[PDB]
Amino acid sequence: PIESAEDLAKQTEIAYGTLDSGSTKEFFRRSKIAVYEKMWSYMKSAEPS
Amino acid sequence: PIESAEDLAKQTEIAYGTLDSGSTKEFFRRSKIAVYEKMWSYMKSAEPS
Amino acid sequence: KGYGVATPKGSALGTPVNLAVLKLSEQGILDKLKNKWWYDKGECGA
Question: Any idea which positions bind L-glutamate (chains A, B)?
Answer without folding.
Answer: 23-24
